[PDB]
Structure formats: structure tokens, C-alpha cells
Design a protein around this ligand. Structure first.
Ligand code: AXL
Length: 343
């Protein structure tokens, strides 16, 4: 007997424990977390025990900025040190007003720092350097709007409306993960690209089988794709290491002692039972150790009639999971510094 599934039992336990505790700590309704082994697509942990991580869809928020960032970089429209002006609000060519989470002093900042702070006013300028059809194409390549094809029941495909349907609001909201709906597994599969030299590897819960007596491992199916170039992947991976740097959205709370973390936070309004934007999903997508990623993690906590933030709600779950996984996988602490671009 060989265990044919990919789940790590102890990691799964840590995942469920942390997630349950955080959903309660924060007064959420539910949560989800997915842990992928980098390079293999092997699913190390999936919480909760339902098919929630596979069937629940929500607007992911600013974790979706990674797609926008990767599109602009891959199309060679901006570099990590390209500067844009950030301000409390910004009025766009099309008449839309974009605002940052909280008012702050107007300043110039690099692309790297814009992502670290997650300034929407800076992000929309990064996104405007590329057309809607191109961004939409990168969204599909990243796996949005499609089932990941994992062999579990009830997987949802999510909602990615054709860009031909995007109005003036959508043009911008889709840049920061609003006006699209994803699953937690889609989030993990997506962030893993940046630790896989731009390659998306479809997630798997079933290893092979021995096939010594009876060939039971699937013929063919699978297939990974190059979403983004190797250089684009490395660059986003470098930029993501700004998350736990001072001023980064994940500072302190997303840090895993002794390991370099690459991360993005998100906080997105979601539609409540009432039919209005009463709810929020707090998201966190991460890669660790950043210098040479071994796992990709996505966490969502959902709260009805309230605000939860990716950093304060979801990052602590990532931390508990990542801390165990590094021991469990016997990964030594980071010997190189956390990457920093000028901001
Ligand atoms: C709260 C933020 C710093 S703003 C920005 C964006 C994407 O998630 N979120 C929003 O613009 C969202 N509409 C929102 C929700 C509640 C807020 O207080 C502010 C912004 N990234 C966030 C993050 O990193 O968690």
C-alpha cells in the first residue's frame, strides 16, 4: 500500500485549525485555504474538508493585481522602477474616480512600491499601459473563468465576463480583482506561476499509482502552459517580497520568522444576501521561501456585513501553515536577503 493522495495529514491539520480559529477570531462566516507544492501541482493541504475551496466563488480583490502587474511587465510596458503618482483619489480618462484604501499624501512611487502598498491609484496606471483584450487574455492564461481540472467533485469555473462586456467601471475594477469571481484553488494555481518560471501547472490531488498490477494512473491528461516569461515571473516574485518590507501591506503580520516571504493581500467587497455590497473577502496569496519557492498558499476569509482585511484576517493563517511546512519539508532558513526594489 502506497498513499495515492497528495495531502499531507499534519499540514492539513494545521491548515484547518488555523483557518477555523481565524474565521472565528474575525467573526467571518467561512474561510478556505489551498497549499500547492511548487513545480508539481501537488495539493499538500485543502481546507476546509468540504468542496468549499473548489466550489465557493468570490471576488478576490487585490491579489488580482498580480495578473495586472504581470501583463504590464510581460508586455514590457513598465519595469519595477517605473514611477507613477499616487494620491488619495485619481480621476481617469474615462471619467472614473479611483481611490486608495485610505487618504494619504500624494507622492511619486515605483511600480514595486505601488504593489507593496497596494495603492489602487498607482495600479490603474500600470493597467492602462495595456489593452483590455490583452489583460483578459492573461486572466485566462492564469486560469480564471475555467475549472482547474482537479479530480474532486463540484469544482466551480468562476466568473470571468468577456472583456467585450466590460464598461467604464469594469475597465478599472478588473485590474484589482473586482468584477471577477475566483475559487481558492484558482488563486493558488495562479500565484504558483511566479515560482514556476511563468509556467502554470494544473493542480493534482492524486499522485500516480504503482501500476505494477493494474495500470490505474490516468492516460495523458494535464498540461501546463507558459503564462508569462521566466523574466516576468522572477520580476513579479521580486516585487512580491515588498509585502513584508516596512510599509508593505503584510508587514509584521505576514512574516514567517527566518524565511523570505513573497505575498499579496486583498480586501474585496462582495454582494450580500441583501443584494448589495455588504460583504468582504479577505485574501492572501503567498510563495515561500521567496528566493526559491517550495509552496504556494492562498487563503480567503469571508465576512458578511463587515470588513476583513487580507493582512489582518488571512495572513496569520498563512503564517501558521508556512511555519509548519518549512519544518515538515526540512527547508533551512533563508540565507539571502529579502529582495528590495527602490520605492
Ligand atoms: C485594503 C487594501 C490596502 S486597498 C487594495 C484593494 C484590493 O484588495 N482593496 C480595495 O480597494 C477594497 N475596495 C477596499 C476594501 C476596504 C477598504 O478599507 C479599502 C479598500 N488592496 C487592499 C489590501 O491589500 O488588502
Amino acid at each position: 500500500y502506497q498513499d495515492p493522495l497528495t495531502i499531507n495529514a499534519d499540514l492539513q491539520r494545521v491548515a484547518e485549525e488555523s483557518l477555523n480559529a481565524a474565521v472565528k477570531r474575525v467573526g467571518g462566516v467561512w474561510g478556505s485555504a489551498a497549499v500547492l507544492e511548487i513545480g508539481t501541482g501537488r495539493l499538500l493541504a485543502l481546507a476546509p474538508g468540504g468542496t468549499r475551496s473548489v466550489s465557493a466563488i468570490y471576488e478576490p480583490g487585490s491579489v488580482g493585481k498580480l495578473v495586472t502587474l504581470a501583463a504590464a511587465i510581460d508586455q514590457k510596458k513598465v519595469t519595477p522602477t517605473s514611477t507613477f503618482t499616487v494620491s488619495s483619489t485619481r480621476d481617469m480618462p474615462n471619467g472614473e474616480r479611483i481611490s486608495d484604501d485610505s487618504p494619504h499624501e500624494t507622492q511619486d512611487m515605483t511600480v514595486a512600491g505601488i504593489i507593496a502598498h497596494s495603492y489602487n491609484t498607482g495600479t490603474v496606471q500600470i493597467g492602462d499601459t495595456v489593452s483590455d483584450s490583452v489583460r483578459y487574455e492573461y486572466m485566462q492564461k492564469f486560469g480564471w473563468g475555467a475549472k482547474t481540472g482537479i479530480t474532486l467533485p463540484s469544482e466551480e469555473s468562476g466568473i470571468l465576463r468577456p472583456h467585450t462586456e466590460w464598461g467604464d467601471r469594469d475597465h478599472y475594477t478588473t485590474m484589482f480583482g473586482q468584477g471577477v469571481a475566483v475559487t481558492t484553488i484558482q488563486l493558488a494555481q495562479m500565484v504558483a506561476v511566479f515560482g514556476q518560471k511563468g509556467v502554470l501547472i494544473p493542480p493534482r490531488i492524486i499522485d500516480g499509482y504503482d501500476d505494477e498490477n493494474g495500470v490505474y494512473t490516468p492516460t495523458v491528461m494535464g498540461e501546463s502552459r507558459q503564462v508569462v516569461s521566466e523574466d516576468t515571473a522572477q520580476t513579479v516574485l521580486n516585487i512580491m517580497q515588498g509585502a513584508t518590507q516596512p510599509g508593505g501591506t503584510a508587514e509584521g503580520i505576514g512574516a514567517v520568522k527566518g524565511y523570505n516571504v513573497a505575498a499579496k493581500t486583498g480586501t474585496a467587497e462582495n454582494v450580500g444576501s441583501s443584494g448589495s455590497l455588504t460583504d468582504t473577502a479577505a485574501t492572501f496569496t503567498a510563495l515561500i521561501p521567496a528566493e526559491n519557492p517550495k509552496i504556494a498558499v492562498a487563503v480567503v476569509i469571508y465576512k458578511e456585513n463587515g470588513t476583513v482585511y487580507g493582512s489582518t484576517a488571512s495572513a496569520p493563517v498563512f503564517v501558521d501553515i508556512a511555519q509548519f511546512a518549512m519544518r515538515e519539508m526540512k527547508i533551512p532558513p533563508s540565507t539571502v536577503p529579502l529582495y528590495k526594489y527602490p520605492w
